Paper text:
Both lectins were shown to bind to a large variety of fucosylated oligosaccharides with LecB having higher affinity for the Lewis a epitope and BambL for the H-type 2 epitope. Despite the fact that BambL was described as a fucose-binding lectin with broad specificity, the present analysis indicated its preference for H type 2 and Lewis y (Ley) oligosaccharides. The active-site in BambL is deeper than in LecB, constraining the oligosaccharide conformation and allowing more contacts between the ligands and the surrounding residues.
The final model was refined in the resolution range between 40.7 and 1.6 Å to R and Rfree values of 15.3 and 18.9 respectively. In the intermolecular site of A molecule and in the intramolecular site of B molecule only the αFuc1-3GlcNAc moiety could be fitted in the density whereas the other residues are too disordered to be located. Solving the crystal structure of BambL/Lewis x complex demonstrated that indeed, the fucose is bound with stacking to Trp, but that either the adjacent glycosidic linkages or the GlcNAc ring are distorted in order to adjust.
Author numbering:
A (entry chain A), B (entry chain A), C (entry chain A): 1 to 87
């Protein structure tokens, strides 16, 4: 089981991505309880990065399944497939 | 052997967490030599994130041992167990 | 195959490091297409962190090959070996 962690803002908000059993899932903290996030994609390995434009977070998650990495994008309205390609 | 890296401030300070042999340890840079940090917890996988409140760093380390992830918190006065729960 | 991801600035710029087959490589985004970066070093595991001094990025990549981690530094003019030592 393998994780990636990101955080932003002053609360802060935290997101922890966990790869387990070929599934990546997401747990979320926004200042009170931890909860399960919307992100669900295939993979055995995960990394992530984020940035703020004002108060709005943008997240990129790099989900690797076997020999292929897929980027997933959060830009305020759902998870969308990004343009990233690997070697 | 698997690592996680965080950094903050303008020096910068860097912390590198290494999982090896079911032990996670910490090496630290604050502008001169690298040294061994106080963090020691069980795990075969590690991620980390941090933020600043003014000059004061807050660190969260996610230590995974088998099928369970535990959060460890640095908030200026020692490492304490966090509220994070996984699936 | 295992990745690390960093990002900076407002574009943003993103760097994704991938360890595969004992080689770590780098893919780069600066606002248009993804491209292959200059970084190439040995390892089966990678983490990374970065910071800005004004507009200038500084990157540290921690490349682990077997039982040894080596730090690699980007400070505006090529990749150089850092002072990091592990246990
Ligand atoms: C508190 C919370 O849950 N916020 C989530 C929110 O997730 C909800 C679920 O709580 C609910 O059960 O289901 C609905 C779908 O019917 C939804 O998935 O979704 C919102 C809207 O996308 C998002 O809240 C925003 O979060 C940011 C954090 O900076 C900010 O506070 C903003 O004002 C909120 O509106 C939350 O979604 C999670 O966080 C995202 C950044 C991303 O990680 C998601 O995958 C998470 O589910
Ligand atoms: C330079 C240094 O060592 N700072 C450490 C400091 O660690 C010391 C050890 O050096 C000494 O050998 O043992 C004592 C215990 O008897 C202690 O563990 O501990 C201080 C206080 O917690 C902390 O320094 C603070 O670091 C921040 C960095 O932003 C800042 O400069 C502040 O002004 C300092 O007081 C250092 O602890 C390390 O960094 C922490 C953030 C965390 O990573 C720890 O696990 C590290 O040991
Ligand atoms: C757009 C781009 O490619 N920028 C790279 C640039 O890489 C070039 C290659 O494009 C070309 O094919 O080969 C030459 C060697 O002959 C070179 O490797 O290299 C520049 C200069 O080092 C660097 O651009 C700078 O990037 C920063 C990003 O913040 C900023 O925009 C600045 O103004 C640019 O000058 C790019 O190098 C990449 O990014 C680095 C941070 C690091 O990740 C490298 O390993 C990447 O190759
Ligand atoms: C926000 C931005 O800089 N660009 C968006 C486009 O690219 C997506 O995000 C960037 C950061 C990088 O992760 C890409 O791989 C990813 O595809 C995106 O394609 C476009 C879609 O309409 O939206 C831009 O805002
Ligand atoms: C600093 C903060 O926002 N909350 C602290 C509490 O939660 C701890 O930190 C947050 C960021 C998250 O990592 C939690 O899982 C973690 O438990 C903490 O329980 C409380 C203890 O007295 O202190 C708050 O400051
Ligand atoms: C930029 C800085 O704080 N120090 C540089 C020196 O150390 C290198 O960078 C730091 C952040 C840390 O990663 C070290 O392990 C790494 O060696 C560097 O040795 C020196 C070389 O001339 O340049 C400093 O600017």
């Amino acid at each position: 089981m393998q994780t990636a962690a990101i955080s932003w803002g002053t609360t802060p908000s935290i997101r922890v991505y966990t790869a387990n059993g070929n599934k990546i899932t997401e747990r979320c903290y926004d200042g009170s309880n931890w909860y399960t996030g919307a992100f669900n994609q295939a993979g055995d390995n995960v990394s992530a990065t984020c940035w703020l434009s004002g108060s709005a977070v943008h997240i990129r998650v790099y989900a690797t399944s076997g020999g292929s990495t897929t980027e997933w994008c959060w830009d305020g309205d759902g998870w969308t497939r990004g343009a990233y390609t690997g070697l």
